[PDB]
Design a protein around this nucleic acid. Structure first.
Length: 115
RNA sequence: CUUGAGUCUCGUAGAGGGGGGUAGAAUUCCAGGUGUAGCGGUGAAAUGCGUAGAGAUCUGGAGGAAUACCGGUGGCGAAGGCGGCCCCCUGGACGAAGACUGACGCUCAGGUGCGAAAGCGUGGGGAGCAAACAGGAUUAGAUACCCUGGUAGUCCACGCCGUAAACGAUGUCGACUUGGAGGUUGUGCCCUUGAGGCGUGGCUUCCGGAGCUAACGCGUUAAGUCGACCGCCUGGGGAGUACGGCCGCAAGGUUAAAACUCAAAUGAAUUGACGGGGGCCCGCACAAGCGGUGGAGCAUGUGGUUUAAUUCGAUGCAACGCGA
């Protein structure tokens, strides 16, 4: 519909999934593609190649507006989830900055018990 | 009488305590938009939540709990314990100069108080987390593991209980006894002539001499040498149990045996066994080449089948052209 060319991307890299969304400087999301929606199940939805193809299928699906520059932040201790941003940048999008914004509390609440 | 003990002056540090405020980050929910087909989870799936529309990104609100970084066997406190910031009140410790009272000191059976967590009662609160419980799969049993929700409870106020590896496994107080390396905190002097050095105080960490000890180990903060007082022990199991007493609303707490059974139970240290590890070395063990067996026939041995007998002996690496 329009042209932005200055956006910001958010990747929720869960320990067993991967979500990616892009918005434009204000919070209004445009497109999203889950790595769990392209035939991937089991542990395949947790591999770096899954992140690669998710980055590809989210980059091609947002070309209706033609974004070039991008802001990007890392969230969640997703194993091997820098391949997705490397691929997004390799797809012709000049990334500006990277930063890990995983939420850290101040001993606010009690985390669930582990095995 | 002033050395022990205590009071006053001047200052220091400290998550010391009680009460009330307030702050930001995170999680939960709600309202308002973006926005589309899954979210979630395991090792795979499933239960659960999704098309009047979810999971992800912005604005605001509502409530509860806790204060990442400084953060460190750092600090304080009799112990339990204490961690955002500020304010009101308060306790304790220590250092410097003096001044003052005059033995006013230590310990303490009964007695009283404080005392982690869990637990109970009344009245509120209840975000996240989380004993039982329900649901899902695996199943001639599932009632163990994992996964999604969740009640007590974790919070507040007033009442209870008074137990723990409440550990420094080391009761309190005083004196004498060679050292080294740190942390923390005052203060005196000399020339503070950059955070100078020297001695002098307090609390705290590690090594180690004599000595003590069964050894491990302790070692000026003694488990060394003594003094004053209190508590506790007389083989293991039965058993911190029964019967009573006291306390408690209840669960229970405290004091606390005997019958019976065994010949030990136990602490330290030694010497080896441990089973995969890691790293360090050799060998036709491999890498590189050549010649071979497993394809055909023959010889030969063994095992099986058979026969009246197929004589006996060898059972992988160490046996099968072995005793022969």
């Amino acid at each position: 519909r329009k042209q932005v060319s200055d956006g910001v991307a958010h990747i929720h890299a869960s320990f067993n999934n991967t979500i990616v969304t892009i918005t434009d400087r204000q919070g209004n999301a445009l497109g999203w593609a889950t790595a769990g929606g392209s035939g991937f199940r089991g542990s395949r939805k947790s591999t770096p190649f899954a992140a690669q193809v998710a980055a590809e299928r989210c980059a091609d699906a947002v070309k209706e507006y033609g974004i070039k520059n991008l802001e990007v932040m890392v969230k969640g201790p997703g194993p091997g989830r820098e391949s997705t941003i490397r691929a997004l940048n390799a797809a012709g999008f000049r990334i500006t900055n990277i930063t890990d914004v995983t939420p850290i509390p101040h001993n606010g609440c009690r985390p669930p018990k582990k095995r």
